[model samples]
Target: SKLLGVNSFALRQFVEGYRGSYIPRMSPYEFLRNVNNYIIENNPTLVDGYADFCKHIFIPNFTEAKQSIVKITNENEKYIKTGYISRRDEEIPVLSRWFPKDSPPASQLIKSKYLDIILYSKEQCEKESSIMNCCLQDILDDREKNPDWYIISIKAQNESFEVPMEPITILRNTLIEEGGSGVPLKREKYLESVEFWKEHAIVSS
Candidate 1:
């Protein structure tokens, strides 16, 4: 509750304040979805406000999803083309608009329950070049460009969620040896005298 900044007392009073005989059986995610749709259609660029509002309201884990939709859909050429600029429309991106018309909306890209499931590295993105990297780049690129689109990283289908680990052990060893000995690799000596195995072989002792 505190993370999103909801005043528990106010929520209680609001629910109690409604002294009428009416009830809505929507889950936190569902309720937020409807509200997000309104925001997407009516107020596209109020992403940060929406995030703070949802957090203040303490909706749910997936509550910030619609914001993700707004990131892509609201900030693109479509916004200028559509001519429907909400107060903060210039702040968000058109990429957020492409989230999904039929599916439930998101408050943030990281909170996407459907698409944010996996991630991958630049090298790994190459192997599946024709498949994952090729198709999802457009969305991920927006996510990459729009810092406000996410408060965290979420996995997407075919996503690896991280970059591959890079190893520099050989380089480190060479640098350490040269730094300690004060002698860089002697090209002539190395080429004529040093055994190929002597320099390249891994030593356990």
Candidate 2:
């Protein structure tokens, strides 16, 4: 339905059940704790624990929607960079946010979320470039509506920061070298997801 855009729904489902073998090494209890916190914060049904939660809402579907799926994670390098195809696996490109492995846990958490937004945005960029670009423009155009709404991420220094609103632009301009345009028909839902994530920190936390 129009209540949630197709794009936003897909991203929600993808991140809700995402598990990177290397990214997060949480114990099952710790993982459940984090998921529970996310559930409480996101206002999902208090439908028991994680399994019921995912069945009811978080990952209601989409086990096979991979298209240039950009898996964002940390690496033992400096600077955040994008566009490195995997060698052994599906060859899906990754956008790595490099940091010293010995960095603070909080710092890694913060950077991971930032990378999540970029990764999700980039995947949407690949799937729906035109509409996604239009949505970004809408967010930019209506910055005055909610001065704090579009604060996408923070720099690890605890300073305010924002994820750029141009994943679709960069993808089409650089990697794909293609172009298109569209009206932001369902863009409001896209904005809502960003707002939701900022408020809840469900996926990135």
Candidate 3:
């Protein structure tokens, strides 16, 4: 368990955040093509043919131009501003809102691998990444050092722009806050949590 010093959400974000080190998004062109393809396949005769022509050669010849048009027109109004909550039927808060709530609510669990810890910082999350990498390396080292401590069912918080990191979304906050001490202990605590069988538990890194 980790101690959440001040606002629980800060720690909650960290807890969910340390999942991994990558973020994935569709290429602008591919994403647009898919959308246009869907619209054409479903439309009526004349409109449908127009859509078909666009995809077949007209669009392909100028695919880059078409892709640009789609991207600009789309303009991503949904993500134009931060903190836009997406709708998900009656369950789950928009994934963007999860970190702001102090605790990981039941809605978080609605998604299969939803225990992500997320945060926004004026500074990139190198500290968080370092701690997580140390923890992972420690786990791997432990498996080599002590066979019994080898990996098993594991849980991890995720960091932004990381893989094996889920519920990916970028929700920026005003981010008013100060930093604190204890780099060492944080690393040790992560190792204990991550590796699962460290005896002295954790001390500052």
Candidate 4:
């Protein structure tokens, strides 16, 4: 139901990205440690309270700001840019190139999530967050109106730090481009695996 990567081969190549075929790597345990530390850093005072911290925070707040993307279509706003297309292979990785042909013809995105990447302006991002908070508050209807009710909310400072937004890679491609829109493929296995299911339709054996 959710996107994982480009294709099956794109899936493998997506792994080799930071998965340790070439670049240096960190431990899986360390990865969790990094995430845990990040959570703590954001809420330094309540390190003790986050025991189940992820319960309702704007991890969902992000869900709100993110849905603002719908506004781009709902209100008919055009905030698009040009992006390139890359190909992935079962073995040899190919170079990513710009659209309108003369690029790798291999046919598979290294990491398709880059497709949805949008460089929403800091101004707009702030607007999205605030407007989202207003909508959420009306429905949350808490008595004291906990500021962190959505779990978290933002005014979006004039800074360049990271937040839980949402990706993948390859040389394979130019990393980032404008107007890219990647939608992972749909699962047609229900149609493709007809015989497998038909084969087991009966348990009479």
Candidate 5:
């Protein structure tokens, strides 16, 4: 409940189950399937002020997810594009949208629920990635230049995700190493002298 910014026991317990049982061991695709299943089974309801609830709690997560996606695309286009990374579409949970059909119809209910689930999944995907880095998959690519650059997958506990050779350097070196360049540097020596900046510049670690 606390992690999801909800106080209800049902909501709290469900999230805990998802965190403990699924995120660590499941594939990204399977984890989301389970979450959607859980919502259908439990069918949770939001408080009266659904729009306010989403604005205050869910918007920040959505904003954060966008920024994270943009950062990943800018730095690692090949990784995200070629099945190395993936992501899920932001959607609302059904519970918040149709828990009690008999209640008065508030359109906000539908809107809030969609935002809530998307944010919920976004945070969990991020959490699992930080801990395991195994479940990252491509989801969507809103970028104009690189329309194929969204990661939307999750990693299983036993899986290992490795970075592929840098595309820019690989093409350059492959050309130069294959005698395209007139300079006479051996392949072994040329590779040894190359440097790649893979880490984020904002952090020194």
Candidate 6:
């Protein structure tokens, strides 16, 4: 609550004094399904000013959601045309004007929740020849041409939340490196756990 700069996080106060960040830890589709319910559950946190405004004023002003569709088009001049997708529009969770990710939402306690998450290495990012490294170059290009940047603490989906979120020094002290499945199991256990979460810990847009 305090990390997000609110007593609790109902939309009325959410709009008035938002100062935290939203991090993702599940699938994007899961986020779409969960966010509305999470906000609804958080509504009671607001005090009278926000609560009253939420009841009488804010609901009418906000809470707007609508259907959306994508017109599939070709990029190259060779195709030069599209099927003009005829599928029914999907029901979007947020307002019609904003993309799914652009909605003003997600207020998890950044330092608290992420304190245990392993930090990324920029040098490791450069060493990769994969797609992760591929788009990273564009961001460097962005740092060059655009130069301006915005800061937001974000979370991505499918993190190994079960893994022990801790620093390597602690892990090293705790993990054993001895023979026998008795000792081997402990080290192997920690090994797989860190590797698992670290794999998912790679952040991208």
Name model 6 segments beyond 4 Å from true: 1-117, 130-133, 136-187, 190-205
Writing each residue's lDDT as its tens digit, candidate 5 over 1-205 gives: 2122211111221221221111223333343334444444554443221112121111111111111101222533333221121111221121101112122221112211122231223343343345334332333212122221112221111112121222232333333222111223345543532332232111000
Candidate topping lDDT: 2
Q: What TM-score do all the candidates reach, one by one?
A: 0.16, 0.24, 0.16, 0.19, 0.19, 0.19
Cand. 1 TM to true fold: 0.16
Residue 161 local lDDT, model 5: 19
Cα deviation in Å at residue 69, candidate 1? 35
Full candidate order by lDDT, most accurate first: 2, 5, 1, 6, 4, 3
Candidate 1 Cα misplacement greater than 4 A, ranges: 1-18, 44-205
Candidate 4's C-alpha runs over 4 A off are: 1-23, 44-95, 98-205
Worst 10 residues of 5 by lDDT: 60-69
Q: Which of the two candidates, 2 or 5, achieves a greater TM-score against the reference?
A: 2
TM-score-superior candidate, 1 or 2: 2
lDDT of all the models against the reference? 0.23, 0.27, 0.21, 0.22, 0.24, 0.23
What lDDT does model 2 reach?
A: 0.27
lDDT of 2 by residue, 141-187 (tens): 21123221111111111212332232332333334212322223235
Q: Write the per-residue lDDT of candidate 1 for residues 1-205, one digit (tens) a residue.
A: 1011111111211121121111123332333244344434445222221112111111123333222212223343232212221212112211111222223232222432332211222322233333222132222221133222211222121221221111221222134222111124444444432333222211000
Candidate 4, residue 136: the lDDT equals: 21
The residue-level lDDT of candidate 2 at 51 comes to 16
Candidate 2 regions exceeding 4 Å error are 12-95, 99-162, 165-205
The TM-score between candidate 5 and the true structure equals 0.19
Return whichever of 3 and 4 wins on lDDT: 4
Query: Model 2, residue 191: what's the lDDT?
Result: 65
